[PDB]
Amino acid sequence: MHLICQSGDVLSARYEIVDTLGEGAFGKVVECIDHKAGGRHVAVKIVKNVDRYCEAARSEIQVLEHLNTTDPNSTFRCVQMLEWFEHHGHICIVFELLGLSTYDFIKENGFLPFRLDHIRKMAYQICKSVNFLHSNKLTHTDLKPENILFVQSDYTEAYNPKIKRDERTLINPDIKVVDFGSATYDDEHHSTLVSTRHYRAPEVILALGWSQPCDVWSIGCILIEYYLGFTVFPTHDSKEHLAMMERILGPLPKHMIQKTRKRKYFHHDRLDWDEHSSAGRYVSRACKPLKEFMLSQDVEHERLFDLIQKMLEYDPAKRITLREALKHPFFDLLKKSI
Template sequence: MACEEDSREATCKDRDLDWHHYSKSSGRSGRSGRSRRSSHRHKDRRRRRSHSRHRSSSRRSHHRRSRKRSRSVEDDDEGHLIYHSGDMLRARYEIVCTLGEGAFGKVVECIDHSNDGARVALKIIKNIDRYREAAMSEVEVLEQLKSLDSERRYACVHMLDWFDYHGHICIAFELLGLSTYDFLKENNFQPFPIEHIRHMAYQIIRAVRFLHKNKLTHTDLKPENILFIDSDYDMEYNPEKKRDERTLKNPDVKIVDFGNATYEHEHHTSVVSTRHYRAPEVILDLGWDHSCDVWSVGCILIEYYLGSTLFQTHDSKEHLAMMERVLGPIPTDLLQKTKKRRYVHRCKLDWDVHSSSGRYVRKHFKPLKHYMMSKGEDHQKLFDLIEKMMEYDPANTVFPFKPD
């Protein structure tokens, strides 16, 4: 588990820090060890706007901030809103406590006094232009999803409200439970029961199919971005392992964090997804589409089954070598098309199996179905599902069944 934690912390070198979204977990867990890709996509969105408009927006930024600022509203040096428990926003949201903090801002638990005192999660974005623009992009996606799923049939988090508070974009969400990663962590990385994985997989796949049907790719699916609606549990002592183990009462989940979601017609940046859940076509710079979400879901499901991340690395070539050890050789045609020529030698992955890294991969990784803990039908079906999701060629990647 120490290796697990060190690896998760190391991702901060690659990408901005993330927070635990809209979840009661964050106050206990602090910042996420894994991180998120974001600035690249938002830079590309800004690049599509005219240069003059961008310069004009930048010139107005300081004026807007000083115009909206009052003596009682202040920011810290990083652009975070300075607040205290009991503060009221818009004479409606009373801040209770901080749930989490990240590169984009903070998430706080609030009492919504306009909704019978309901508890909500309020995401308060930094008062900085690039983060404000990124937040408005997320608001657009969330508004679209809300209109498409007014009956809440799909397991996607719902935005309840949003507003601009003295230069800080604030987004209100339903308050959910722990993220699936946090639950694993607090349960000593004990795998989820197979029946819970089946239930969670159904909801995740159904939600992702809903996104894809509406021409939207999430691009950052990972256990941190899948939250339990209610993470209450029963506790039981395991005498063999000499520790308490938690079992969820309700495995219902919701997908969160649409800050990096991309429509089909939008510019696709070359790199998407958090490292451990990144599809091979993204690593090989072959372009990507909805299939990168499918790969990520496959990685998530096997993590739920094992209790730990399958591909623990921060080196792209080693990542590809791990894939080959688990899933077999990468197809020659994909290696011939990649722009990353340093990964290829004579139409094969340029990988030295006798190096220290090569020996590590061979020792610690094995073919996919060798990870099965039982030959039972449920286990076999789960691994058949994961195998179909973790397909090298995006052209052949589809969800293997229609949950609707």
């Protein structure tokens, strides 16, 4: 796909490529000048010409047509799709241009976490956006910091002596949600596997059936990452991930081990887990109870951790909904009267 385009090329007789914004297994996103919209800069996702990504792209176009007509002012912060077309047999989707992902920001900030005031604002907007999907019988299923994009990524920089780090701070942390190629309607077939290892809910790993609550799980994991700069589940292995969940959040509920067909993770009613193995020693060093990750015992940190704990409830029915999350005390500060 280096083959099919480059800087200076004009796509669909109107979109002049001026930059490549990023690349992925999924394809790439380029920045274009739209010569038929007064020179508006747009993002064009150019989809890898592979069955999986083609199918996801057609699905994304259908979901965004739905969300974007349902919410034409983008009150709920889903990215606006402008149109789509084909280029050398690749699907190309045109979006309003957004800045870099929250992942890429953290990376470019030397994996320093966001300060709590920005986490509060971003968390509220993510919950509100993803709650709009949940209001429209949709589950995103692949939420991650890479899929949350800043509207504008201008920042200030200052030495912080506390951590002896130069630190970037966004001027405006407003976000939009992207990547609707895995989004699943309530009445559609639910894939066995959904989500990216570090954000997968326990009911997904244990194949107990998933729906909107698996997005809540993902968002709790995203907020921990925002807070720390790193995932608290640093693994790609499902069984190790369960072992990390057990160290950070406590024992899996007996009713989830009882029901699961994923007997390969278990020995009787316990995780089939050797604490003394390489992976066992890594899990014991790397993981600890959730509240031990708090950087401050200040009440605003307790409030965030209270919300994260509710989002990381194992039972997906008990798990806080995003409608309830938007009412959580952590967001009181956002509701202080002007």
